[PDB]
Amino acid sequence: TIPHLAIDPFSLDFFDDPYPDQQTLRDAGPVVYLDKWNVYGVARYAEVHAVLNDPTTFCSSRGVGLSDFKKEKPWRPPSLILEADPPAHTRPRAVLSKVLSPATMKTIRDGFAAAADAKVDELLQRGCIDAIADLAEAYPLSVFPDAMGLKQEGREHLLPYAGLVFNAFGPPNELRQTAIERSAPHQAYVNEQCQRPNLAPGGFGACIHAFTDTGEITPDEAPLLVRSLLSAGLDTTVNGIGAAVYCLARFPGELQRLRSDPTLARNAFEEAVRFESPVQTFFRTTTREVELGGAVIGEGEKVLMFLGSANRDPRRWSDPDLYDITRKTSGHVGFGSGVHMCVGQLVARLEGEVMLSALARKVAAIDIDGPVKRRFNNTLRGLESLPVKLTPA
Length: 393
Ligand code: HEM
Ligand SMILES: O=C(O)c1ccc(I)cc1
Ligand SMILES: [Cl-]
Hints:
By secondary structure, this protein is of the alpha+beta class. It has one domain. The protein is 46% helix and 13% strand. A hairpin with a 6-residue loop joins strand 11 (373-375) and strand 12. Helix 10 (204-210) packs antiparallel against helix 11 and helix 12 runs parallel beside helix 16 (345-362). The longest helix has 25 residues, at 102-126. Bound molecules: protoporphyrin IX containing FE (HEM), 4-iodobenzoic acid (KZ6) and chloride ion. The site of chloride ion (CL) has 4 residues, from helix 9. Heme b binds at residues 89, 93, 284, 340, 342. GO terms for molecular function: heme binding; iron ion binding; monooxygenase activity; oxidoreductase activity, acting on paired donors, with incorporation or reduction of molecular oxygen.
């Protein structure tokens, strides 16, 4: 009753061009079984959304990667928010929500916007740049470690640590195994910076520690919540902003619409999150036998959610394969959905908005002018190198 497929969604051939295999996965049925890894898959919007919004049946505390924490030891202590279920999830989630809140965004917006305009001005002076290293990586590196309150020394560990985190959600393939092999120095740097004395006053890290006296978290929880922001908060935005720039480089008509109304910058970024889905996949584990789209899934089974495929499901989206900066994107699952829906989405959107605003006001054209190289990661979709020529407006 459930179709069995041999597609490996963690293979380099799939990362290289996932869209045919995603259609195959959607059209095979609402629930597939992936024989390569012995997990269930859901690739349509309706089932991805249903799974995300039933945390009791499809839990996160057994790990949101392939590994089942009830069977194997996690490679690092579980995240107190991503890898927790209600009710343990609830109060740590409330603390990060207040740390990364609307009020916080007001304190950081002017500096994030200045840094974005400055970076685009700098890049227009060079003309031909790499939109990954010089822009999608450089701009978040110029604002986010400072917003965390991190010291200068050791920041080169941040992107390696995040690549490790996102590879470690995957199955035990060579991407995962090599990342873990190399991990010790990046873990040791990250874990150290999570301690209260190492986080500068006023930053997100110190704000987490400052919340340890309200009864929501205790002091011994705050290092791991800082770890969550140092895991999720940089590399995701690198690939979100890289997605948007790639979209604008491929779809010049849409750069032109964005130039003509820079207030489209925030929706242009949202649409790039839908269109590319920087965070491709997460897993759940079933806590009971459950009927999902006619298929009966047993207890204790891993379920792989294809967020990017749900975001390109023609059963939900008109012309899903078109980048449309005036699309009504509400409902996409590029940030998740439900109780774990990205708690950092206001930081993500603020960064993406102020960078696309800078491009809209300052850049007349973005032309690819070199070989495009794709970066392979078990969870993140994005580019290694994106050589572009920027023409000034
Ligand atoms: C374009 C940028 C980003 C994307 C695409 C993205 C994606 C996601 C997704 C898909 C989830 C849901 C996880 C799940 O359901 O299991 C999530 C959760 C989360 N994200 Fe984001 N993320 C981004 C940026 C950020 C930033 C900038 C931060 C921190 C500053 C952040 C911190 C978190 C945390 C802590 C969670 C866990 C929330 C919870 O479990 O309740 N993310 N993110
Ligand atoms: O809690 C974490 O470490 C974590 C949370 C969200 C993402 I997306 C990645 C990592
Ligand atoms: Cl760690």
